[PDB]
Design a protein around this ligand. Structure first.
Ligand SMILES: CC1=NN(c2ccccc2)C(=O)C1
Ligand SMILES: CC1=NN(c2ccccc2)C(=O)C1
Ligand SMILES: [Ca+2]
Ligand SMILES: [Ca+2]
Lengths: 204, 204
């Protein structure tokens, strides 16, 4: 009875791991495509599956971090959203923390995305007229040339400054979408998606 | 591009169907075992997966009804829980409605469970001192000998009447657990559980 219960629990853990990879792939695809409602529903499903998982491999922690990173990026302009226990941390600051924690290559693309999130974390505060909050986000992030231009823009209250149009929110999203394409290629071969693709193909 | 998007959406629908069957099996097992916290977490996951499914086969609608039925039975004593748009309907009354909708055999066990839910729908109102609500649940359900004993118990305010000890909440749960064992046997062969069981066995 206890041996059967144990084997069942191990099988549920295997299946939850397969569901996590599939939901991550679906979340990545919805983000890349701009399917806002599918992203919201898929995120809700990923969150619930994650609460049913206890022990995680390094690969599963990376998968969860990718889901959490895209969720904060999708909420980047929602300044009322609180992703951390410290209520002062904005969504883009929370995405920046996860970006620096993922076990991944620090290639040129990694650093470009990092710097684009930093500029936009300040930009989104300025665009909402939250000038003192922009300065507080600046101090938390920064923790010379790039740093000093940003402090000058904050002090002038230059909300629609051309610097934010050159390193825009759209540019940040496009660079992140290039990274998402690589996650999509890497996870397209995971168990659940492969088996489901084989079913659809066999009916064609 | 549209052909690929279409094939991907079909594969996501296949995978969501496999996840629904697996989550139903896990929910049934947690209910049978009395694993309250695992039931709560599994229910949250089933709800989210169901919102990501659009077209349902007759088999998938039956699977969803089984999940909804067990959720209302688990909440049978939570008289503040509102499962229907009509706020007057109690959780056991909502379970009774689903029980009468499932495409299943009306064998002796089906009717015994039905009558046990009817008695307990009244019993739970009486036990909370909600005498007028017990009479209202009675009128909505009933909708001669069984009916008249119940109306007499309600009018006397006989909360701890021996009739409710003979056709108890425990007796209702045990009969429902016998039905759950049959659902467990039937869904143990579904794709995701079978594949996960094969993985665990191969590591022994
Ligand atoms: C709201 C939140 N969603 N999430 C989240 C977590 C895992 C997968 C997808 C999303 C957070 O961490 C906070
Ligand atoms: C609360 C509720 N949970 N549910 C539910 C639905 C599907 C699966 C599991 C549970 C309801 O219908 C209302
Ligand atoms: Ca805020
Ligand atoms: Ca109530």
């Amino acid at each position: 009875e206890e041996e059967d219960a144990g084997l069942v629990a191990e099988a549920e853990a295997v299946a939850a791991g397969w569901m996590l990879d599939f939901l991550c792939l679906s979340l990545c695809r919805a983000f890349r495509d701009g399917r806002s409602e599918d992203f919201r529903r898929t995120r809700n499903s990923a969150e619930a599956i994650i609460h049913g998982l206890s022990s995680l491999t390094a690969c599963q922690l990376r998968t969860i971090y990718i889901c959490q990173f895209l969720t904060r990026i999708a909420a980047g302009k929602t300044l009322d959203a609180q992703f951390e226990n410290d209520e002062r941390i904005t969504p883009l600051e929370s995405a920046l923390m996860i970006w620096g924690s993922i076990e991944k290559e620090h290639d040129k693309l990694h650093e470009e995305i990092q710097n684009l999130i930093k500029i936009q974390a300040i930009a989104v505060c300025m665009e909402n007229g939250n000038f003192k909050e922009a300065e507080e986000v600046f101090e938390r992030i920064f923790g010379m040339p790039f740093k000093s231009k940003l402090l000058m823009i904050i002090s002038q209250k230059d909300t629609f400054h051309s610097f934010f149009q050159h390193f825009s929110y759209n540019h940040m999203m496009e660079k992140i979408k290039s990274y998402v394409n690589y996650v999509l290629s890497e996870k397209s071969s995971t168990f659940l998606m492969k088996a489901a693709a084989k079913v659809v193909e066999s009916k064609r």
